[PDB]
From Swiss-Prot:
This is Nucleoprotein. ADP-ribosylated. The ADP-ribosylation is retained in the virion during infection. Phosphorylated on serine residues by host GSK3A and GSK3B. This promotes the solubility of homodimers that would otherwise aggregate. Host phosphatase would dephosphorylate the protein during assembly at M bound membranes. Changing residue 126 to R: Significant increase of RNA-binding. It is found in: Virion; Host cytoplasm; Secreted; Host extracellular space. It comes from Severe acute respiratory syndrome coronavirus 2.
Length: 126
């Protein structure tokens, strides 16, 4: 069982997450500037109060390029529930040296965005 290195973003609006070009990569003091490139993947949740199934707010998790459930997708590839972010100067190389997080070893890093970053409407961290 693998996981994202960071906590999720919650979606309250009716559109997909989209960061302006050059923003969206969470801060990680253990990574290099060459690493600040990846994708958010959407995870959906449904529960059952007696109206059968109820759709909860979808969450978005960040994975470095070349890692995670879509490790094989190249940067920019079009797929539902996958959005791409990168900081300027980051290399378009797989980040296999960072990999994914094993929850049995490390807790998730609190997702913090760089200074002056704008989240889309309805999106909130934790």
């Amino acid at each position: 069982n693998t996981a994202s290195w960071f906590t999720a973003l919650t979606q309250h609006g009716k559109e997909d997450l989209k960061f302006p070009r050059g923003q969206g990569v969470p801060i990680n003091t253990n990574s290099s500037p060459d690493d600040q490139i990846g994708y958010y993947r959407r995870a959906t949740r449904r529960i059952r109060g007696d109206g059968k199934m109820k759709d909860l707010s979808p969450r978005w998790y960040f994975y470095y390029l070349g890692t995670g459930p879509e490790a094989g997708l190249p940067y920019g590839a079009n797929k539902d529930g996958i959005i791409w972010v990168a900081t300027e100067g980051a290399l378009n190389t797989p980040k296999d040296h960072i990999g994914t997080r094993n929850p049995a070893n490390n807790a998730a890093i609190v997702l913090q965005l760089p200074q002056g970053t704008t989240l889309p409407k309805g999106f909130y961290a934790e």
